[PDB]
């Protein structure tokens, strides 16, 4: 155990955070893939900026109040059930709580410096209590049980929004996401494309694996470069004229749609979308 900036102890079969106060200038501590079952002696590591507890057996977030300078906290693939113990980490800019058992969003009111929030693969059911995170650039809520898009009006700086594999049924609540550039809504229950009038900066729109039946209300998305609409119910070939305003469009996914039953499926797309260079998985000649 030296005294350098970075300390990397991955897959070391460590089951207790014992004797780490010796580090005098540690900035990044990596403790991925260990047998750590509780967060303990991290007090004297005040100079710590990045803490990585990826894939451990932690059940409670605790004893993190002394790390007032923490910027990146990763407690992904653990046994967490509630969000807590992060109110002192005022300069947190990245928070990873991936693949836990978190049921609701809470105790995040003090993180005014957060640019990235990863709550994917949890048990969250509603978008709540994120009104104070005005500096959020990316919000990842994929694989949960969310039923309705709401409480996103304060995130005017949001650029990437992922809501894949949830229980949504209607697009809404994006009226104030004016700087949104990537939107992922695949594997939900959405049936109609709507509510994207204020998101002209969109370059990526993913609404695959839904129940969409007609392409409408995206004529103004002139900055679209990627459009993933596979596994839907698109039937009208005339709907592709809605995307002619996107002259930088490079990729479209339309396979496993009723439109793919056409014997000339790949030709009619590149004739209606001459700027596209990739149709489904393969490229255009």
């Amino acid at each position: 155990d030296r005294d350098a900036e970075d300390v990397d102890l991955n897959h070391y079969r460590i089951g207790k955070i014992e004797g780490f106060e010796v580090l005098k200038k540690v900035k990044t501590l990596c403790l991925r893939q260990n047998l750590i079952k509780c967060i303990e002696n991290l007090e004297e590591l005040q100079s710590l900026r990045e803490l990585d507890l990826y894939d451990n057996q932690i059940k409670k977030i605790e004893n993190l109040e002394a790390l007032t300078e923490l910027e990146i906290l990763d407690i992904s693939f653990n046994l967490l059930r509630n969000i807590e113990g992060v109110d002192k980490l005022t300069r947190l800019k990245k928070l990873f709580l991936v693949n836990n058992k978190i049921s609701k969003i809470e105790n995040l009111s003090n993180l005014h410096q957060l640019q990235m929030l990863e709550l994917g693969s949890n048990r969250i059911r509603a978008i709540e209590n994120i009104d104070t995170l005005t500096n959020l650039e990316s919000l990842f809520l994929g694989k949960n049980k969310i039923t309705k898009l709401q409480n996103l009006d304060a995130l005017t700086n949001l650029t990437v929004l992922s809501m894949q594999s949830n229980r949504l049924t209607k697009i809404e609540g994006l009226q104030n996401l004016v700087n949104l550039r990537e939107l992922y809504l695949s594997h939900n229950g959405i049936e109609v494309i709507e509510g994207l009038e204020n998101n002209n900066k969109l370059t990526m729109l993913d609404i695959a694996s839904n129940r969409i039946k007609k392409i409408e209300n995206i004529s103004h998305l002139t900055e679209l470069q990627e459009f993933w609409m596979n596994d839907n119910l698109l039937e009208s070939w005339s709907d592709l004229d809605e995307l002619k305003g996107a002259r930088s469009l490079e990729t479209v996914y339309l396979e496993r749609n009723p439109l793919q039953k056409d014997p000339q499926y790949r030709r009619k797309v590149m004739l209606a979308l001459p700027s596209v260079r990739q149709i489904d998985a393969t490229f255009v000649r």
């Binding site: 990397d8 991955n10 047998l35 693969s121 993913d206 990729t251 393969t282």
Partner: protein, 298 residues
């Protein structure tokens, strides 16, 4: 395959193997174009070969890897790096950790370089959604972008789903299916396709053998079913087979037999998850269809 692509493929394999024996945590950073090239070129090879592979001995059959890239390099130490040996993997190459990219990129690189001597089947982790699996999607957007994960799903949709070794060993990730009566049903499945929530393709990647079940019982995963010992015996007698070779489930010694050694569950990822101290196994099949088992220690 071009010769300029051969030398670029040798460079990718070389850079992926430079970390052999190093710290279990060191990563190899490939460009986004190189990873995409592995996905597109290997996808054509998967589609140019049958969805139901018919392989011949000798070859070594490995189980789950689960993104443990440094245990994959150990498998190639015990069995021999290609083309010293022929390999067949039974799916589940990506999962937790931050090495699932190196794991799949090395396997796809070997698939492109040795298409008739290196074979990969499709596991339930090689799906095109994040309905149940999130680790690999998390790793892609984090070292690169979400689009790179979408390119992988395109490659995963073309993977074969089952293999028959010398008309005697039936190989798949999950197990048998209540809708599997003829092998032509497997060949009838068209690619590309996402793993459905039910049907023949789903059970081939999700079903499990159970000791306390007679016939077909509900699976505790909530997906597919569980089958009993007598179901395996009638499957082998009907199709004139000698052994079912599957994976999907963790076993302590790396391999475990079922229905009086008529089925074997291979798991090649030692020390999976936290403190459950299982080992990895690798079943070798020689020219006379004799099965030997090598064991890797965690």
């Amino acid at each position: 395959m071009s010769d300029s692509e051969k030398l670029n493929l040798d460079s990718i394999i070389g850079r992926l193997l430079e970390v052999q024996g190093s710290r279990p945590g060191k990563n190899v950073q490939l460009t986004e174009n190189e990873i995409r090239g592995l996905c597109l070129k290997s996808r054509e090879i998967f589609l140019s070969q049958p969805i139901l592979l018919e392989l011949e001995a000798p070859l070594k059959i490995c189980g789950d890897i689960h993104g443990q890239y440094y245990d994959l390099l150990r498998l190639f130490e015990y069995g021999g790096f290609p083309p010293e040996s022929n390999y067949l993997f039974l799916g589940d190459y990506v999962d937790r950790g931050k090495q699932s990219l190196e794991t799949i990129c090395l396997l796809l690189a070997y698939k492109i370089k040795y298409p008739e001597n290196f074979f990969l089947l499709r596991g339930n982790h090689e799906c095109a959604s994040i309905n149940r699996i999130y680790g690999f999607y998390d790793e892609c957007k984090r070292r690169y972008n979400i689009k790179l994960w979408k390119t992988f799903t395109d490659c995963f949709n073309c993977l074969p789903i089952a293999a028959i070794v010398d008309e005697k060993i039936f190989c798949c990730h999950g197990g048998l299916s209540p809708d599997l009566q003829s092998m032509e049903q497997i060949r009838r499945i068209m690619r590309p396709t996402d793993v459905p929530d039910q049907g023949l393709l789903c059970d081939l990647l999700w079903s499990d053998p159970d000791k306390d079940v007679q016939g077909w019982g509900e699976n505790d995963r909530g997906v597919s079913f569980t089958f009993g010992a007598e179901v395996v015996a009638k499957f082998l007698h009907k199709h004139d087979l000698d052994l079912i070779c599957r994976a999907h489930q963790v076993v302590e010694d790396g391999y475990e037999f079922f229905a009086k050694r008529q089925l074997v569950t291979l798991f090649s990822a030692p020390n999976y998850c936290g403190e459950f101290d299982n080992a990895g196994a690798m079943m070798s099949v020689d020219e006379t269809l004799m099965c030997s088992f090598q064991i890797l220690k965690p």
